[PDB]
């Protein structure tokens, strides 16, 4: 289609640090992909990011009970929605499926875990190889799970026993797999 | 440590809107504008929390009225298209006669309009697939996820049509 | 519990 498009985006961000101890709130308005007006709980009032949001900042900050409402958003909005989903979001724990297999270089498939905090470590015989820690990086499956392939570049010689160790906040002890 | 984002948008002249909550990159839920219903990313979520989707439709109503004012402010300057970056992948190691599912991950694009189909052996396959809504980004572009369960002679392509693309982008995955 | 949405404010006209 030839006719042009016009995009308006609004994002209400709640940033948490050490749980609900330190909370920062952002009320951001966007045109196409350019922010033009923003409320920040650290600043305390609406400010114009670009020249395009200057009328909104002037008009919104003058509305009755506006400043009192946005300055209380960290309590009525952010800290509230944090406790609503805390049981199945902040405390969601899904244990990882670890698979070791090469296709020489060994690959430690780590699938279906959550959250993204994780550590993978190879062991030649209990030394923890450093040379050859080729990792494909953490990737997000979009279904509240993560996976990551952790390849090792070594020549498996005779009865050498390689160990893929996995450390995740869902477990109490590291998980190990051998080949 | 954690970030919760309530993302909304409206697009003209296509007249399509969307509303969702993001938790550390994953969607908590979205609101289907057509059925005026709240759709949770995981069916289990709806049994632990609730959200009246009526408030989502009112926000979109305001975003539509705001868009014209902003468009009229900017002397009707359009949005410049940005081509997406697809990446197909599987979520488990591939094994014959053992089921799995492909993932066609569209990344870094705008506006949020895509024509995405699954090509098997050159013929489209629409049976058993699943789609997610547009997901927000820090640079305010968008992401998307498509899924296709299958059983691993068959070649599988992910055809992606976007206005920022001169030709429909093909990404192949065969065993 | 129940989720609360921050309402979208009307732009200056």
């Amino acid at each position: 289609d030839t006719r042009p498009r016009f995009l308006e985006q609004v994002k209400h961000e709640c940033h948490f640090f050490n749980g609900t101890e330190r909370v920062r709130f952002l009320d951001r308005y966007f045109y196409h992909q350019e922010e033009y007006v923003r409320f920040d709980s650290d600043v305390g009032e609406y400010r114009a990011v670009t020249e395009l949001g200057r009328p909104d900042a002037e008009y919104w900050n003058s509305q009755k009970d506006l400043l009192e409402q946005k300055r209380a958003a960290v309590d009525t909005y952010c800290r509230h929605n944090y406790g609503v989903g805390e049981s199945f979001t902040v405390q969601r724990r899904v244990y990882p499926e670890v698979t070791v297999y090469p296709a020489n270089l060994l690959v430690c498939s780590v699938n279906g875990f959550y959250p993204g905090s994780i550590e993978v470590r190879w062991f030649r015989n209990g030394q923890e190889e450093k040379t050859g820690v080729v990792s494909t990086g953490l990737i997000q499956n979009g279904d509240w799970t993560f996976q990551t392939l952790v390849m090792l570049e070594t020549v498996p010689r005779s009865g050498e026993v390689y160990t893929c160790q996995v450390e995740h906040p869902s477990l109490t002890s590291p998980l190990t797999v051998e080949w | 440590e954690h970030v919760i984002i309530q993302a909304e948008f409206y697009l003209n002249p296509d007249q399509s809107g969307e509303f969702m909550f993001d938790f550390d990159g994953d969607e908590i839920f979205h609101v289907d504008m057509a059925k005026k219903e709240t759709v949770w990313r995981l069916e289990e979520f709806g049994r632990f929390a609730s959200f009246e989707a009526q408030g989502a439709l009112a926000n979109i109503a305001v975003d539509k009225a705001n868009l014209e004012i902003m468009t009229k402010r900017s002397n009707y300057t359009p949005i410049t298209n940005v081509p997406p970056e697809v990446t197909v992948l599987t979520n488990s190691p591939v094994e014959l006669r053992e089921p799995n599912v492909l993932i066609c991950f569209i990344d870094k694009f705008t506006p949020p309009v895509v024509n995405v189909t699954w090509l098997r052996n050159g013929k489209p396959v629409t049976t058993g697939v699943s789609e997610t809504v547009f997901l927000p980004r820090e640079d305010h572009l968008f992401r998307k996820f498509h899924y296709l369960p299958f059983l691993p002679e068959d070649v599988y392509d992910c055809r992606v049509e976007h206005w920022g693309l001169d030709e429909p982008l093909l990404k192949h995955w065969e065993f | 519990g129940g989720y609360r949405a921050r309402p979208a404010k009307a732009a200056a006209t």
């Epitope: 009970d65 | 408030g55 109503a61 305001v62 | 519990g1 609360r4």
Partner: T-cell receptor, first 114, second 113 residues
């Protein structure tokens, strides 16, 4: 959704303490907010005080009310009522997880006799 | 403030009446409340940015209208004796339940057979 408060009119001598009972039966309220509205003689409705968090309490004009989610109550108190406090006090209830929609109690009429 | 009109009105059963309200608080959301002969306050309509968001099973008899964010009008075509009440106009910063409602002086309607 219903709100029950002290019925009818209450006559109190000045400098006496006052308690206006109010309980709400949130049966399908995901995020209840509690309100006390007042209408002084010859004027219109205006907010006396409100509480948004389930544990806190709000105060204004010497009045005090504690959002108590355990006994699902929101009683209004004052240690020494003044003759200017004679008015009609309304207990209100809203659901913050929805559009704003106030459910009012029947209202309590206060008469402070000097 | 929140101004509404008229202050008083008396009319026969079956006539038309028009109430008008305006608020100068820059608010996005406005309301109409009915106070029956038993002093029970109950919401009727709620508008947000010229659009209706809350209809508390009000009869089709009632027709609210708003072509501006700061205005909200109410027309009752063919009134009934049950329509005799006090109608309060209110406004809030937005449709969030944690916002204060600012009420007008009210319209006292008397419908007679």
């Amino acid at each position: 959704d219903s709100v029950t408060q002290t019925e009818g009119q209450v006559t109190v001598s000045e400098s006496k303490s006052l308690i206006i009972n109010c309980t709400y039966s949130a049966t399908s309220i995901a995020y209840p907010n509690l309100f006390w509205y007042v209408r002084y003689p010859g004027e219109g409705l205006q907010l006396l005080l409100k509480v948004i968090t389930a544990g806190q309490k709000g105060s204004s004009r010497g009045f005090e009310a504690t959002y108590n989610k355990e006994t699902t109550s929101f009683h209004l108190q004052k240690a020494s009522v003044q003759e200017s406090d004679s008015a009609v006090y309304y207990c209100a209830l809203s659901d913050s997880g929805s559009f704003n929609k106030l459910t009012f109690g029947a209202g309590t009429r206060l008469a402070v006799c000097p | 403030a929140v101004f509404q009109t008229p202050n008083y009105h008396v009319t026969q059963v079956g006539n038309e009446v028009s109430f008008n309200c305006k608020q100068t608080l820059g608010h996005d959301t406005m309301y109409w409340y009915k106070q029956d002969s038993k002093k029970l306050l109950k919401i009727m309509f709620s508008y947000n940015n010229k659009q209706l968001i809350v209809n508390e099973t009000v009869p089709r008899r009632f027709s609210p209208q708003s072509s501006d964010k700061a205005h909200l009008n109410l027309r009752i075509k063919s009134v009934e004796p049950e329509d005799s009440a006090v109608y309060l106009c209110a406004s809030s910063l937005d449709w969030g339940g944690q916002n204060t409602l600012y009420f007008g002086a009210g319209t006292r309607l008397s419908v007679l057979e």
